[PDB]
Design a protein around this ligand. Structure first.
Ligand SMILES: CCCCCCCCCCCCCCCCCC(=O)OC[C@H](COP(=O)([O-])OCC(O)COP(=O)([O-])OC[C@@H](COC(=O)CCCCCCCCCCCCCCCCC)OC(=O)CCCCCCCCCCCCCCCCC)OC(=O)CCCCCCCCCCCCCCCCC
Ligand SMILES: CCCCCCCCCCCCCCCCCC(=O)OC[C@H](COP(=O)([O-])OCC(O)COP(=O)([O-])OC[C@@H](COC(=O)CCCCCCCCCCCCCCCCC)OC(=O)CCCCCCCCCCCCCCCCC)OC(=O)CCCCCCCCCCCCCCCCC
Ligand SMILES: CCCCCCCCCCCCCCCCCC(=O)OC[C@H](COP(=O)([O-])OCC(O)COP(=O)([O-])OC[C@@H](COC(=O)CCCCCCCCCCCCCCCCC)OC(=O)CCCCCCCCCCCCCCCCC)OC(=O)CCCCCCCCCCCCCCCCC
Ligand SMILES: CCCCCCCCCCCCCCCCCC(=O)OC[C@H](COP(=O)([O-])OCC(O)COP(=O)([O-])OC[C@@H](COC(=O)CCCCCCCCCCCCCCCCC)OC(=O)CCCCCCCCCCCCCCCCC)OC(=O)CCCCCCCCCCCCCCCCC
Ligand SMILES: CCCCCCCCCCCCCCCCCC(=O)OC[C@H](COP(=O)([O-])OCC[N+](C)(C)C)OC(=O)CCCCCCCCCCCCCCCCC
Ligand SMILES: CCCCCCCCCCCCCCCCCC(=O)OC[C@H](COP(=O)([O-])OCC[N+](C)(C)C)OC(=O)CCCCCCCCCCCCCCCCC
Ligand SMILES: CCCCCCCCCCCCCCCCCC(=O)OC[C@H](COP(=O)([O-])OCC[N+](C)(C)C)OC(=O)CCCCCCCCCCCCCCCCC
Ligand SMILES: CCCCCCCCCCCCCCCC(=O)OC[C@H](COP(=O)(O)O)OC(=O)CCCCCCCCCCCCCCC
Lengths: 231, 62, 177, 136, 125, 178, 51, 109, 102, 168, 67
């Protein structure tokens, strides 16, 4: 399981290995002789185009809405207590209308779905238009998430919890830098791996590696300090 | 009650006191601009001594 | 044995000397040591540990020596003020003394500043100046009790050496022009 | 160290200091960091040979410090980047005097490696100053 | 381990190389082997013995002086102490006054002796 | 893991994290055993609320044994639990887990106060009577006191002898080929 | 697969107990929550090990 | 444990069993022949009959363990000697009583 | 100091004294338990001194095998496509051909 | 050994404050002292773990031959400064100091203020002079100056002599 | 003394300072290095033999090991 696999890909390494690259265009090119239906159906590649800002914003909004609906299903609705009269009226609606449960679910999940969609869209636009080309990636993530979650906790939950929102945002930014923008448990390269370029003979490479080993010996403290017994 | 601290006393003085650390940091950075452009002492952990502590006894044993 | 800390950056490293390409996140401990961490953190990394300790001590003594120059010129100005009346005092000061006072200003001598901001070249020059003074002193062996420690045999040998050197210098003829 | 004598000096001994080029300093520092193993090896092998054949009656007394020759040659090659010969004996005339001083420091006077590394680095610096663009 | 005299012949190496890698004088070899080029292990041992003896003397003298002073001048109030010392015999008064001072002064003198390097043979002129 | 002309060099001991985990488990069990032995030495019915920590305000041995056991559970440096916590943090740093170190520290400090706050309740107006009476006199068990004393000695001086325990645990874990 | 599940469980547990461990008023609850806190710490250590 | 040769060799079929006496007799014969050959690299083809007997008698996992152990033994024999190791261990144990003070103001590196 | 038997004897003596103090009984109670504790402590700590060194020796020997596991585990951990790369191809062939000496 | 000696000072001081302080508020003051100082102790412990795990050395002088990257160096300096400033009181981490000084034995307050806050300074000096740091110290200087300003401004409003001396 | 007589370093330093390093490296580092250099030893031996002979091999020249 990997998070944000496409972004953290070594194009050079995959190219030298021949491994398929996630940066391939992934596009459809219908022929001019093809049917009109085929030409129309080939337009779906715009739904895969990752450079379409509107598509990405709707994608982020859908993610946020799904998260909000899941939160409502799990914790939000069960924690919130509805008035007895309101419950009786909505149960009466279920009795008097077919599929009344669907409309009740729509009514209950509308707030969570809408707020989740708004948060997702705003967060995507915020992170993309701002902080996308900063120098210190960790600092950018921490500051952006801190500010965003401070505002989010002030608005959605309560203005009196904005400090906790900011602290949670700092924690979430650190976590995202650790396991979303970085590959700690998602390694796709062997540690110490490399590639060879240039017309260097195997003898020359072995000689250079012998020199590298001699240098590496100095890492050991005992040899550097000359504190070894005569074997 | 929550938020009483800002109102109590004088709001302007409370805000100034709250922002004092930011003012100090900004003054330090503006001062360090002068150091950078001139060549004088700058706010950094100078490392002239290669880890050699002040008047430390450096000896070896047979 | 020295180790390393896992890297997160996704940059590529091209080593032209070894003719290989690595990635920052994929480096092991030795590769990190070779490529990262190879920068210098002292004025004269070429010197050994003992040599750089001597260099550091000479640099500290040289800073103190420049401060001593400033203190001496200030004392000379006080002496001039006391000895010479205010009339002609500035006339006599507008000479070597005033130029030296200005030339020993803060950029050239660290009076009371926390750090004397010196490039490695400037530090090397200061150490060379201190070593030149040390060489001049040791020619005649003026550093036995102060700025040096020696045994009795060393002192006797140095006395004989200085005696021979002084005799040769006296016998040398005057420099022409 | 890093002091040049005054050619036209009123008195017998006068010295004027100089600062080596940043390229020379970088080269010496990098090569010392890479080849420091050989210098420690030279020290340890010098002590080992003295212990083994220091006594006059020892059978190998006539071969003293010859085993250190391989270490010295390896150190020279590492410091000079395998150029300018494969042995210390192949040192250029510019550094021959400093090489002789280093050998006297190490094997005849048996002075500390702190002292003799100065002369070895002087050999390397002489070669680097002579060539310049050849080593970098 | 390939660093050994085995297999080495003087014929292979040049005369200059042999002269370069020739053993120094026997005295020089002995000094290098014993690490006595500058100072002898016996000199180190003598210095250590003197240091330990000086520390023991200094610490014992300080302890004796401190305890004697405390016990002699910690008998009660001013009036009580004055009356006790007045009834004190002549020799007892002398010891009470002199013991603490002598112990402390001897400790301080032994401390000063080490830093003061008077026993240097170059005293002349 | 380094490669020099097809020669692998390994300066890392893989069977070390498991040894550290075993060490932490053993240290927690030892401290838990110490506190539970202190409890068992006394009357069990007295301790039923955090307020009842004052009931430990008994003669010096029990009082200070409880205090040091609570501190050790908290993770105060000189005591035994500190060794486990410090070695866990050291292994996390060795594995280059800065976020894990951050979360470990948050949990450690919160738990530290959780243990420490009971020292406030330990204070009692008078001396408690928590010992069972047998033959008209309080029953003090020499065997449990001796076991508590050995546990106290090891709790105080675990750092000194920890190298041997670490060697033994690494020896046990090295058999696992992971 | 285990790494992400362990991380999520550890984070949720820490943020859930940070407040609960200060709401108990019983000796048995104190002992149980000591065990729970140590369990979470050892789970974090296990994540570090499996890394 | 997927990478562990020992743990993988500990696996077996439900009805599989090992005749250790026969396997060790065959392995002893084959290794005696190999030692008589005394080559740097074990060339089993120089001992065809014993090699076939060893293959038949011993299981693949047992053979893998035996070959790895033989390689380790060859490396140790090339490197060290009994008297050398005895002297080195004695010197190291003697050193363990003393302290290892830092060497300040070094000359290398 | 150097004798583990003497160290254990001292440990047992101090343990007995501490037990008496903790129990609030006179230190002269049950005098026969002093030599008993000293002997038990000396023997157990002597055995542990032997056991720690035996465990250390066996651990050093086990690390030799663990190095073999690490080398082969590293090669099998290589990502798909890296086993024939220039950085691992020679080592992979060494472990797949030269060491295929069954 | 340096770090262990630094961390050993907690137990005796806590025991003195807990069992020797006459005032009843000393019970809570001791807990505040322990928690506030232990947070900084954990920070310094993290820094020491970073140094030891990365550099296996312990001689305090082998660090000359090992250079920490920029990220490692900045993390180490931040952790070291904050951790040692928890002990050596800095703004805003002086609430524990005020509480402990007010509610501690008058004889132990002398020892605390006089000495126990300077072991942190000594440790910070040692670590930061051993490590090479390539970061701007403006933030740390600002923190120190803010602490000075805060304490100086609050001096006036203290009618309690012990608390006034604590602010000094 | 006795408890530390196994290693010159103190027990606390042994327990904490050494994290993840092989006990073969902590104790008996000479054997660890020699095992690590096993093949380099024979390469150096072959280089010395060839150097005594007319041939001079530059590939293995850097391999001059003393520990
Ligand atoms: C397979 C397992 C399940 C089998 C069926 C159940 C039998 C097993 C039961 C045991 C299992 C656990 C049950 C727990 C019950 C919990 C309580 C409860 O809800 O029941 C109490 C409820 C009340 O009990 P009562 O008081 O006795 O009865 C009072 C009334 O008489 C009752 O009358 P009523 O009309 O009031 O109740 C009707 C009831 C049952 O529901 C129905 O009436 C039938 C619904 C059929 C599905 C309709 C959706 C479209 C399906 C398309 C399928 C093809 C897709 C192809 C895609 C191709 C792509 C290329 O309504 C609901 O459950 C409400 C939700 C129904 C809609 C679900 C929509 C899922 C997709 C949503 C996606 C996101 C949309 C975003 C917005 C998009 C806008 C454009 O009990 C019942 O009515 C009978 C049991 C019904 C259980 C339904 C459980 C939910 C699952 C529904 C189907 C999900 C399909 C998912 C795949 C397709 C996705 C598109
Ligand atoms: C960012 C660009 C900067 C450059 C541009 C130029 C500078 C522009 C700065 C802004 C100036 C105009 C806005 C200030 C309005 C007053 C503050 C405020 O809003 O708080 C609510 C305001 C204050 O509430 P409060 O403090 O709770 O009331 C206390 C009671 O009056 C009971 O009082 P009490 O009888 O107990 O006596 C206590 C009294 C007296 O207290 C004392 O004696 C103790 C000392 C107090 C501080 C005195 C100032 C010291 C110098 C400050 C330097 C700051 C440097 C760091 C910041 C640098 C930023 C660049 O405390 C006060 O001072 C309260 C009066 C308001 C604060 C006045 C002093 C601070 C104002 C901000 C100065 C910023 C200067 C920046 C440039 C610096 C040089 C580079 O509430 C009211 O409206 C009630 C009436 C208060 C008197 C108002 C007098 C007229 C002010 C102008 C009105 C027209 C403004 C039009 C604005 C148009 C859009 C921009
Ligand atoms: C009758 C026993 C006679 C013993 C005589 C001395 C012989 C050694 C002790 C042998 C005891 C064996 C049986 C266990 C009895 C204790 C447990 C018990 O249940 O007793 C109940 C028994 C009766 O019950 P109770 O008295 O009603 O209950 C009261 C409580 O026990 C509460 O009482 P407490 O508050 O007084 O308890 C002590 C308190 C506070 O105790 C301390 O703080 C101990 C301070 C010792 C003085 C020296 C400290 C020097 C530190 C310098 C920095 C080193 C840094 C090294 C790097 C790593 C970090 C350490 O708690 C702690 O110990 C926790 C902090 C531990 C800090 C770790 C310091 C390690 C130092 C290692 C030795 C270094 C030697 C260097 C010189 C030689 C070089 C070759 O208790 C007693 O009779 C009093 C026991 C008091 C502690 C005794 C030991 C203190 C003196 C140690 C001197 C030798 C150095 C230490 C090493 C010893 C060998 C490993
Ligand atoms: C750095 C962190 C370190 C953390 C350490 C954590 C643990 C520390 C505390 C516990 C340590 C064990 C203490 C001894 C056992 C408890 C009972 C006891 O002996 O006192 C009763 C008994 C009291 O006698 P009493 O008061 O006259 O009469 C009592 C009743 O009236 C009448 O008595 P009774 O007739 O009812 O019962 C008589 C029997 C009562 O004693 C018992 O029945 C023993 C109960 C414990 C059984 C488990 C012992 C396990 C020992 C191995 C290491 C693991 C220890 C784990 C401990 C915690 C486990 C939860 O007495 C004995 O025979 C005592 C023998 C004790 C030594 C047993 C050694 C077994 C070794 C088995 C494995 C060998 C290696 C296999 C390798 C295989 C390789 C393939 O003790 C004594 O007579 C002497 C007391 C004073 C000296 C005590 C010396 C203790 C030395 C402990 C060394 C620990 C290992 C080395 C240090 C490791 C870290 C560097
Ligand atoms: C476990 C570790 C915990 C870490 C704690 C992290 C602290 C989180 C603090 C959040 C503060 C609130 C969000 C700030 C968002 C803006 C950040 C920014 O602009 O910096 C981006 C830019 C992007 O920088 P960059 O990434 O291009 O370059 C980085 C440079 N180096 C590598 C040297 C670090 O960064 C900065 O210029 C500031 C960096 C330091 C942070 C300063 C925060 C200032 C907050 C107050 C702003 C006041 C505005 C005016 C109003 C004043 C009052 C009236
Ligand atoms: C009573 C007398 C009072 C006198 C005035 C006292 C001070 C008043 C406030 C001074 C503010 C100075 C601001 C400029 C300095 C910025 C330093 C810096 O680089 O920080 C970047 C910081 C981050 O710095 P950093 O430390 O990350 O930088 C990287 C490290 N270096 C630089 C070494 C490479 O980014 C910020 O967060 C800055 C936020 C600024 C928010 C807006 C401030 C506006 C202030 C306007 C003041 C009014 C006008 C001037 C009045 C006086 C005119 C004479
Ligand atoms: C060839 C072998 C020959 C062996 C011959 C047998 C030798 C026997 C030696 C016995 C020595 C007994 C010494 C008792 C000293 C009592 C001092 C005292 O008064 O203290 C009271 C004090 C006070 O006890 P208290 O609690 O009654 O206090 C009284 C004071 N008030 C009133 C205030 C309460 O307590 C003690 O110290 C006594 C208990 C500790 C006794 C420790 C004895 C250790 C014995 C070690 C023997 C080691 C032998 C090694 C042999 C090796 C052979 C290879
Ligand atoms: C108060 C006098 C101070 C004298 C100055 C030196 C003090 C040295 C430390 C002594 C500590 C107390 C004794 C410890 C005994 C012990 O168990 O000591 C045990 C250890 C034995 O160590 P080993 O077992 O390793 O050999 O003792 C020593 O190592 C040396 C002890 C000190 C030797 C000098 C003795 C001087 C005697 C002076 C007598 C006059 C004093 C007058 C005072 C008023």
């Amino acid at each position: 399981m990997e998070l944000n696999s496409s972004a953290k890909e070594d194009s050079h390494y995959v190219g030298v290995l021949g491994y398929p690259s996630q940066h391939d265009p992934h596009t459809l090119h219908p022929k001019k002789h093809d049917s009109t239906f085929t030409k129309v159906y080939a337009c779906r590649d715009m739904l895969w185009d990752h450079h379409w800002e509107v598509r990405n914003t709707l994608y982020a909004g859908f993610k946020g809405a799904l998260l909000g609906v899941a939160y409502a299903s799990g914790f939000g609705l069960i924690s919130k207590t509805v008035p007895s009269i309101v419950l009786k009226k909505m149960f009466r609606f279920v009795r008097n209308n077919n599929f009344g449960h669907i409309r009740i679910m729509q009514d209950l999940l509308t707030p969570y779905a809408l707020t989740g969609f708004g948060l997702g869209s705003v967060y995507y636009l915020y992170q993309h238009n701002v902080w996308e080309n900063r120098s210190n990636k960790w600092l950018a993530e921490v500051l952006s998430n801190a500010l965003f979650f401070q505002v989010a906790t002030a608005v959605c939950v309560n203005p009196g919890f904005h400090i906790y929102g900011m602290v949670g945002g700092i924690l979430f930014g650190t976590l995202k830098y650790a396991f979303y923008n970085s590959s700690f448990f998602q390694e796709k390269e062997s540690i110490g791996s490399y590639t060879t370029f240039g017309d260097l003979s195997e003898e020359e490479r072995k000689k250079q590696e012998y020199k590298d080993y001699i240098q590496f010996l100095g890492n050991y403290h005992k040899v550097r300090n000359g504190q070894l017994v005569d074997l | 009650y929550d938020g009483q601290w800002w109102s109590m006393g004088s709001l302007a003085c409370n805000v100034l006191f709250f922002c004092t650390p930011l003012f100090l940091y900004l003054i330090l950075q503006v001062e360090e601009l002068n150091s950078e452009k001139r060549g004088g002492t700058s706010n950094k952990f100078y490392h002239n001594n290669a880890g050699f502590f002040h008047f430390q006894i450096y000896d070896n044993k047979q | 044995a020295f180790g390393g800390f896992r890297q997160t950056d996704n940059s590529l490293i091209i080593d032209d000397r070894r003719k290989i390409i690595l990635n920052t996140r994929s480096l092991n401990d030795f590769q990190q040591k070779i490529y990262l961490r190879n920068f210098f953190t002292n004025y004269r990394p070429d010197l050994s540990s003992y040599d750089y300790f001597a260099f550091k001590e000479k640099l500290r003594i040289g800073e103190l020596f420049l401060n001593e120059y400033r203190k001496r010129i200030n004392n000379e100005v006080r002496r001039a003020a006391i000895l010479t009346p205010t009339s002609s005092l500035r006339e006599k000061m507008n000479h070597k003394i005033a130029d030296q006072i200005l030339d020993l200003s803060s950029p050239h001598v660290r009076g009371a500043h926390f750090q004397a901001v010196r490039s490695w070249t400037d530090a090397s020059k200061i150490v060379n100046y201190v070593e030149e003074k040390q060489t001049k002193i040791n020619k005649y062996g003026l550093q036995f009790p102060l700025l040096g420690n020696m045994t009795e045999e060393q002192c006797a040998s140095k006395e004989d050496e200085v005696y021979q050197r002084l005799l040769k210098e006296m016998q040398k003829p005057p420099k022409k022009a | 160290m890093f002091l040049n004598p005054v050619k036209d000096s009123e008195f017998d001994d006068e010295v004027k200091g100089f600062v080596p080029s940043e390229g020379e300093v970088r080269f010496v520092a990098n090569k010392n960091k890479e080849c420091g193993y050989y210098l420690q090896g030279i020290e340890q092998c010098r002590r080992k040979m003295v212990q083994l054949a220091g006594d006059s009656s020892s059978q190998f007394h006539s071969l003293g410090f010859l085993p250190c020759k391989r270490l010295v040659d390896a150190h020279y090659r590492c410091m000079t980047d395998d150029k300018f010969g494969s042995t210390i004996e192949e040192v250029p005339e510019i550094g021959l005097d400093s090489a002789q001083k280093f050998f006297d420091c190490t094997f005849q006077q048996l002075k500390p490696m702190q002292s003799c590394r100065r002369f070895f680095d002087q050999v390397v610096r002489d070669v680097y100053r002579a060539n310049g663009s050849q080593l970098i | 381990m390939n660093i050994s005299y085995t297999g080495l012949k003087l014929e292979d190496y040049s005369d200059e190389v042999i002269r370069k890698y020739k053993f120094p004088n026997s005295n020089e070899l002995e000094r290098f082997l014993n690490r006595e080029q500058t100072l002898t292990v016996q000199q180190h041992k003598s210095a250590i013995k003197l240091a330990q003896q000086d520390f023991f003397a200094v610490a014992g003298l300080l302890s004796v002086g401190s305890l004697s002073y405390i016990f002699y001048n910690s008998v009660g109030g001013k009036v009580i102490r004055d009356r006790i010392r007045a009834s004190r015999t002549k020799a007892q008064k002398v010891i009470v006054l002199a013991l603490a001072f002598v112990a402390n002064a001897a400790a301080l003198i032994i401390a000063r002796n080490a830093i003061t390097a008077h026993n240097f043979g170059w005293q002349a002129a | 893991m380094s490669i020099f002309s097809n020669i692998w060099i390994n300066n890392d001991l893989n069977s070390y994290g498991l040894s550290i985990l075993l060490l932490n488990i053993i240290n927690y069990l030892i401290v838990f055993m110490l506190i539970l032995s202190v409890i068992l030495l006394t009357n069990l019915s007295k301790f039923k609320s955090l307020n009842q920590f004052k009931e430990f305000n008994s003669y010096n041995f029990i009082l200070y044994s409880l205090i040091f056991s609570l501190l050790s559970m908290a993770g105060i440096p000189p005591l035994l639990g500190f060794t486990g916590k410090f070695l866990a943090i050291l292994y996390s740093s060795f594995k280059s887990q800065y976020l894990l170190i951050l979360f470990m520290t948050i949990l450690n400090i919160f738990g530290m106060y959780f243990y420490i706050q009971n020292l406030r309740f330990v204070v009692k107006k008078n001396k408690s009577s928590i010992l069972n009476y047998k033959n008209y006199y309080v029953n003090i068990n020499y065997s449990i006191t001796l076991n508590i004393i050995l546990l106290n000695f090891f709790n105080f001086f675990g750092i000194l002898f920890l190298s041997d325990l670490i060697i033994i645990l690494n020896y046990i874990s090295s058999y696992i080929y992971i | 697969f285990f790494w992400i599940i362990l991380l999520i469980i550890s984070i949720i547990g820490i943020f859930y107990i940070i407040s609960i461990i200060f709401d108990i008023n019983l000796f048995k609850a104190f002992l149980a929550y000591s065990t729970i806190i140590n369990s979470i710490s050892f789970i974090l250590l296990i994540i570090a090990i499996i890394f | 444990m997927e990478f562990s040769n020992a743990l993988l060799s500990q696996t077996k079929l439900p009805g599989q069993q090992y005749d250790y006496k026969r396997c060790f007799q065959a392995s002893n014969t084959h290794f005696e022949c190999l030692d008589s050959i005394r080559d740097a690299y074990d060339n089993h083809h120089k001992c065809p009959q014993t090699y076939q007997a060893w293959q038949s008698s011993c299981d693949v996992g047992i053979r893998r363990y035996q070959m790895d152990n033989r390689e380790q033994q060859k490396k140790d024999q090339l490197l060290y000697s009994k008297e050398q190791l005895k002297n080195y261990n004695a010197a190291k144990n003697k050193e363990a009583y003393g302290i290892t003070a830092p060497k300040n103001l070094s000359f290398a590196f | 100091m150097s004798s583990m038997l003497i160290w254990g004897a001292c440990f047992g003596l101090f343990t007995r004294a501490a037990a008496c103090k903790a129990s609030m009984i006179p230190l002269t109670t049950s005098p026969w338990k002093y030599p008993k504790y000293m002997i038990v402590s000396a023997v157990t700590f002597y055995y542990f001194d032997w056991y720690r060194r035996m465990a250390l020796e066996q651990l050093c020997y086990n690390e030799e095998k663990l190095e073999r596991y690490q080398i082969r585990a590293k090669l099998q951990s290589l990502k798909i496509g890296e086993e024939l790369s220039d950085a691992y191809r020679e080592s992979f062939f060494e472990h797949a051909v030269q060491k295929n000496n069954i | 050994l340096f770090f262990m000696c630094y961390e050993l000072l907690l137990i005796p001081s806590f025991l003195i404050v807990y069992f020797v302080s006459p005032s009843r508020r000393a019970i809570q003051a001791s807990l505040y002292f322990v928690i506030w100082t232990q947070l900084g102790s954990l920070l310094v412990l993290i820094a020491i773990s970073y140094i030891i795990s990365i550099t296996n050395t312990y001689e305090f002088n082998d660090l000359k031959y090992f250079n920490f990257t920029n990220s490692e160096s900045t993390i180490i300096i931040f952790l070291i400064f904050l951790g040692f400033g928890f002990k050596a009181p800095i703004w805003p981490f002086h609430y524990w100091l005020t509480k402990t000084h007010v509610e501690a034995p008058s004889g132990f307050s002398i020892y605390l203020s006089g000495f126990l806050v300077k072991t942190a300074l000594y440790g910070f000096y040692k670590f930061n002079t051993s490590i090479f740091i390539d970061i701007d110290s403006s933030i740390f200087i600002a923190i120190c100056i803010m602490g000075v300003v805060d304490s100086s401004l609050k001096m006036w409003g203290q009618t309690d002599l012990k608390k006034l001396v604590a602010y000094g | 003394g006795v408890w530390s007589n196994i290693h010159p370093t103190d027990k606390v330093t042994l327990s904490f300072a050494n994290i993840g390093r092989p006990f073969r490296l902590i104790y008996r580092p000479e054997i660890f290095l020699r095992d690590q250099q096993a093949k380099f030893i024979q390469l150096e031996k072959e280089h010395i033999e060839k150097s005594k002979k007319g041939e001079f091999v530059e590939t293995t020249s850097p391999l001059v090991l003393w520990n």
